């Protein structure tokens, strides 16, 4: 029967690919590997010359990949995301100079721009009547897969006391295996913009001069540009700030995997506890992004103020609570933006909100972090994001009056 083969051989493989594509045990230990003794990079080379290329090339590969995710029907970009991940972990094993690691982040931002590849691959593959179940099984296999990689990465370092190079060699045994699984993925019969079934890009602009008159799209798409640009400027640099607090050899005590597993677990509890409040807390929505942004302002300042190496555990939990605070709003942000919009347009306004959050992320990184513009250290940059989230909290809270 073609019903059992469409679930046991397709959906049980679709959740298995989304599990195994997220298995990267050395994902949370990239910057401890670079700052470690094996690669010997200083904290000024990774903060001012390597990680700014992660925010530059992500501007340069966002709109090419998003236009080529739909032209190729999502399967070569799901192959490109897996194959560029192999190219990252080859440069983390065969790269010495700082010019090699600037190519490591350029290949890493390809895998950052292709996060919407697999999320929109399930929309084009499965039937529209049975999409809410398969995407429910797909977001419970990626989120399980991105939680297991932070636990398997942590357990194979703390419990199984091996070096970081043994860990990232294990991470090639789960990334070449994610290229093999991405070869055997079914190309969907339809796309979203280019390979349709048959106005396009004329009906949408008619449905955008009037949909932008809505106040929630005038607010949450203005939160996605600015609050979700300073959020990625923390997550890129918080692994350097943890290494500035407690620079440690004897590598079984780094605990970056447990602060990425707990921030996924709090990024799912506070996301599941956000589906209950996306309807009720829609009246004073600008007050909700005024308290959480101020909660994100007090946690970015807590990261920039801890100094003793024995107080790093109140610095991991300042990031687990930070990553869970942003993950409380994106279920509400992806609902209040995609409420009245069509699926051929809400996934377009998420290609503008992400692109405008990447111009802002490129503006701040060239101004506050890159060695050509200012070149600040990772602690004097995190005090420039505590002001940035607090300025964003005397705008939404000040805007709550008007």
From Swiss-Prot:
Q: What is the effect of changing residue 343 to A?
A: Reduces methotrexate uptake. Reduces IRF3 phosphorylation upon cGAMP stimulation
The record gives the membrane topology as: Multi-pass membrane protein
Show which residues sit on the Cytoplasmic side of the membrane. Answer: 70-73, 122-135, 278-283, 335-348
Indicate the impact reported for residue 24 to K.
Enhances methotrexate uptake
- Give the primary localization class: membrane
For the Extracellular compartment, the record's topological domain ranges are: 33-46, 95-98, 161-165, 243-254, 305-310, 373-380
| Key word Transferase present | no
Catalysed transformations (reactions): 5-amino-1-(5-phospho-beta-D-ribosyl)imidazole-4-carboxamide(in) + (6S)-5-methyl-5,6,7,8-tetrahydrofolate(out) = 5-amino-1-(5-phospho-beta-D-ribosyl)imidazole-4-carboxamide(out) + (6S)-5-methyl-5,6,7,8-tetrahydrofolate(in); 2',3'-cGAMP(out) + 5-amino-1-(5-phospho-beta-D-ribosyl)imidazole-4-carboxamide(in) = 2',3'-cGAMP(in) + 5-amino-1-(5-phospho-beta-D-ribosyl)imidazole-4-carboxamide(out); 3',3'-cGAMP(out) + 5-amino-1-(5-phospho-beta-D-ribosyl)imidazole-4-carboxamide(in) = 3',3'-cGAMP(in) + 5-amino-1-(5-phospho-beta-D-ribosyl)imidazole-4-carboxamide(out)
Question: Where does the UniProt annotation locate this protein?
Answer: Cell membrane; Apical cell membrane; Basolateral cell membrane
Region annotation (Required for substrate-binding) ranges: 357-369
Entry's disease: Megaloblastic anemia, folate-responsive: An autosomal recessive metabolic disorder characterized by megaloblastic anemia resulting from decreased folate transport into erythrocytes. Disease manifestations include hemolytic anemia, hyperhomocysteinemia, and low vitamin B12. Serum folate levels are normal, but erythrocyte folate levels are decreased. Treatment with oral folate corrects the anemia and normalizes homocysteine.
Q: What is this protein called?
A: Reduced folate transporter
Organism, by scientific name, is Homo sapiens
């Amino acid at each position: 029967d073609p019903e059992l083969r469409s679930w046991r051989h397709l959906v049980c493989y679709l959740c298995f690919y989304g599990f195994m594509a997220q298995i990267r045990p050395g994902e949370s230990f990239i910057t401890p590997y670079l700052l470690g003794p094996d690669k010997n990079f200083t904290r000024e080379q990774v903060t001012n010359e390597i990680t700014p290329v992660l925010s530059y090339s992500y501007l340069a590969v966002l709109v090419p990949v998003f236009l080529l995710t739909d032209y190729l029907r999502y399967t070569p970009v799901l192959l490109l995301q897996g194959l560029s991940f192999v190219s990252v972990w080859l440069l983390l094993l065969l790269g010495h100079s700082v010019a090699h690691m600037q190519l490591m982040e350029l290949f890493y931002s390809v895998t950052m721009a292709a996060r919407i590849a697999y999320s929109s691959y399930i929309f084009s593959l499965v039937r529209p009547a049975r999409y809410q179940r398969v995407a429910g099984y797909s977001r419970a296999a990626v989120l399980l897969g991105v939680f297991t990689s932070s636990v398997l990465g942590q357990l194979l370092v703390t419990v199984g006391r091996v070096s970081f190079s043994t860990l990232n060699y294990i991470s090639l045994a789960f990334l070449t295996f994610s290229v093999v699984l991405a070869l055997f993925l079914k190309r969907p019969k339809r796309s979203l913009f280019f390979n349709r079934d048959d106005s396009v890009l004329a009906r949408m602009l008619r449905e955008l001069g009037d949909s932008l008159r809505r106040p929630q799209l005038r607010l949450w798409s203005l939160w996605w540009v600015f609050n979700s640009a300073g959020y990625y400027l923390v997550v890129y640099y918080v692994h350097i700030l943890w290494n500035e607090v407690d620079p440690t050899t004897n590598s079984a005590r780094v605990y970056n995997g447990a602060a990425d597993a707990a921030s996924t677990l709090l990024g799912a509890i506070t996301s599941f506890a956000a589906g209950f409040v996306k309807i009720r807390w829609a009246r004073w929505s600008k007050l909700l992004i005024a308290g959480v942004t101020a909660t994100q302002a007090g946690l970015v300042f807590l990261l920039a103020h801890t100094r003793h190496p024995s107080s790093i555990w109140l610095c991991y939990a300042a990031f687990v609570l930070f990553r869970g605070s942003y993950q409380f709003l994106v279920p509400i942000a992806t609902f209040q933006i995609a409420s009245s919009l069509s699926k051929e347009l809400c996934a377009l306004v998420f290609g503008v909100n992400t692109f405008f959050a990447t111009i802002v992320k490129t503006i701040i990184t060239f101004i506050v972090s890159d060695v050509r513009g200012l070149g600040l250290p990772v602690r004097k940059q995190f005090q420039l994001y505590s002001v940035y989230f607090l300025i964003l909290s005397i705008i939404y809270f000040l805007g709550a009056m008007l």
